[PDB]
Design a protein around this ligand. Structure first.
Ligand SMILES: CC(C)=CCC/C(C)=C\CC/C(C)=C/COP(=O)(O)OP(=O)(O)O
Ligand SMILES: OC[C@H]1O[C@H](O[C@H]2[C@H](O)[C@@H](O)[C@@H](O)O[C@@H]2CO)[C@H](O)[C@@H](O)[C@@H]1O
Lengths: 364, 151
């Protein structure tokens, strides 16, 4: 059309993004429609009903770009200097920029200071910690077990990894999903489940509700979740993740980015919107005040918000972890681990079995 | 199934009166969920002795195991619930998902009295797991010299 359709995951500040669209809309006359559909990262390659712009962490955009689903953005040096270089590196595929970097996200430990004035530093403590908390009618830790994004920091602590990075590229044959480190991490989780210290059916909604209601002393989540906790009148702290084997949890650092559909007749309106309305202190502030973005890619607004201790913890956990790859094989990675984790966690398969399949299906 | 779910909820939560009601309306004592978890599994791990006794009184299977091979005895010993453990041994070496027995657990977590009662009831001291660790090996690895001594 002559419009702008925009897609962003439901757990972000889409109302604040919609407000940046309405400013753009009235200033130019181009209607903007922001949507947050379920499984949007999977429907986009099916339908690119295609949106003009898609928001997501950069990991999935390399698969979109290799399939030719995204247009190449055209920012000049003057604009590239507005954002931190490493953010551009994360949205770079085969030497060409395929998306706009927006915000750097990482998972952190979030604890209720009225139930837990001092949080544990290790995963081994959680078990005993939960025994003393259930006498109080509470739980120790509750987070999303249906998405490996949240369990991966533990899986990668002892040694697990996704794709080895060698001499500039990621080796698709060096996958660390079945090694001892990953088996150790997932074994700890499955035993906390088998010991009834965790529930396998715990998802994002259940964990967020439980934590924001003071029913569990801890959870694991990212910036976008903070707003909902502020309004829950819960005294919480955002801090480093618990260690495993004395080693830190290693979360995957995602970079929320905006890619332009190749099939979009509105690629220059998209550039104007993303370049001169969203990637400004005012556009980023609007979205951040709706749901926090973390450490934004824009140097000015990020330098401004740098003193937020929750963001300092976020990039501390990120400094322990690794930047996500954008290679198309990441899709296979996330799909195999996810199935493995949910089958081990539920007893359908053993940790060794589940991880053996996954390793092979990723190295196919 | 539906009442059974409610019974699992009351047993897990420690609602002695809710369990009393559900049983009055025909709830199944051995109701199993997706994971083979029964009310006795949940009451034992949650430390509610009163419910444990009631379930047993109603014909609950003591030696029932879940998809992980965990029995009510294993949970009681894993969570250090001595009084429940005794009741479960009163009603009747079962290995778990990694070959670990209730004695491996008591030794791992320093539950001396539980160790005493398990050994007193025929617990296999030679019980091995995937890595070949005996409950003695776990006592020493986790700094439980005292319980290791009794072993
Ligand atoms: C939540 C939880 C702990 C469940 C435990 C499962 C269970 C019921 C019993 C035995 C567990 C055990 C000995 C674990 C570590 O052994 P280890 O001394 O070899 O220590 P490591 O292998 O982890 O280093
Ligand atoms: O679980 C796999 C999933 O992990 C990441 O998605 C995260 C996202 O990065 C976070 O910002 C937040 O929105 O939660 C998501 C997980 O629920 C990957 O970016 C994604 O590719 C992958 O599917």
């Amino acid at each position: 059309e002559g419009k702008l359709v925009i897609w962003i995951n439901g757990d972000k500040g889409y109302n604040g993004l919609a407000e940046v669209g309405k400013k753009f809309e009235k200033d130019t006359g181009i209607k903007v429609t922001v949507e947050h559909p379920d499984k949007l990262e999977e429907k986009f390659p099916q339908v690119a009903d295609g949106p003009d712009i898609i928001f997501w962490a950069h990991d999935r955009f390399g698969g979109y770009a290799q399939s030719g689903l995204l247009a190449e953005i055209t920012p000049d040096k003057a604009f590239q200097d507005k954002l931190y270089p490493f953010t551009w590196d994360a949205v770079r595929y085969n030497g060409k920029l395929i998306a706009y970097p927006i915000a750097v996200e990482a998972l952190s430990l979030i604890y209720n200071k009225d139930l837990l004035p001092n949080p544990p530093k290790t995963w081994e403590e959680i078990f005993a910690l939960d025994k003393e908390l259930k006498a109080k009618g509470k739980s120790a830790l509750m987070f999303n077990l249906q998405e490996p994004y949240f369990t991966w920091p533990l899986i990668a602590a002892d040694g697990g990894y996704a794709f080895k990075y060698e001499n500039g590229k990621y080796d698709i044959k060096d996958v660390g999903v079945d090694n001892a480190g990953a088996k150790a991490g997932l074994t700890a989780l499955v035993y906390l489940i088998a010991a009834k210290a965790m529930n396998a059916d715990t998802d994002y909604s259940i964990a967020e509700a439980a934590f924001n209601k003071g029913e569990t002393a801890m959870t694991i989540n990212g910036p976008w979740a903070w707003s909902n906790i502020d309004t829950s009148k819960v005294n919480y702290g955002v801090t480093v993740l618990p260690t495993f084997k004395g080693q830190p949890s290693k979360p995957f650092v995602g970079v929320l980015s905006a890619g332009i559909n190749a099939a979009s007749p509105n690629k220059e309106l998209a550039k104007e919107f993303l370049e001169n309305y969203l990637l400004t202190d005012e556009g980023l502030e609007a979205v951040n005040k709706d749901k926090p973005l973390g450490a934004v890619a824009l140097k000015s607004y990020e330098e401004e918000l740098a003193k937020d201790p929750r963001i300092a913890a976020t990039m501390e956990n990120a400094q322990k972890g690794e930047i996500m790859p954008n290679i198309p094989q990441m899709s296979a990675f996330w799909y195999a681990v996810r199935t493995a984790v949910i089958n081990a966690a539920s007893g359908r398969q053993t940790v060794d079995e589940a991880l053996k399949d996954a390793q092979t299906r990723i190295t196919k | 199934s539906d009442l059974g779910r409610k019974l699992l909820e009351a047993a897990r939560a420690g609602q002695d009166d809710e369990v009393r009601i559900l049983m009055a309306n025909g709830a199944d004592v051995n109701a199993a969920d997706n994971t083979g978890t029964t009310p006795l599994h949940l009451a034992a791990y949650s430390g509610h002795l009163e419910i444990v006794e009631v379930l047993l009184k109603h014909g609950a299977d003591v030696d029932a195991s879940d998809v992980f091979g965990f029995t009510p005895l294993g949970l009681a010993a894993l969570w250090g619930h001595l009084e429940i453990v005794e009741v479960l041994l009163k009603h009747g070496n079962a290995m778990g998902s990694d070959g670990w027995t209730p004695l491996h657990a008591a030794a791992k977590f320093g539950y001396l009295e539980i160790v005493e009662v398990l050994l007193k009831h025929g617990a296999d001291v030679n019980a091995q797991d995937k890595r070949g660790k005996t409950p003695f090996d776990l006592a020493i690895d986790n700094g439980n010299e005292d319980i290791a001594e009794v072993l």
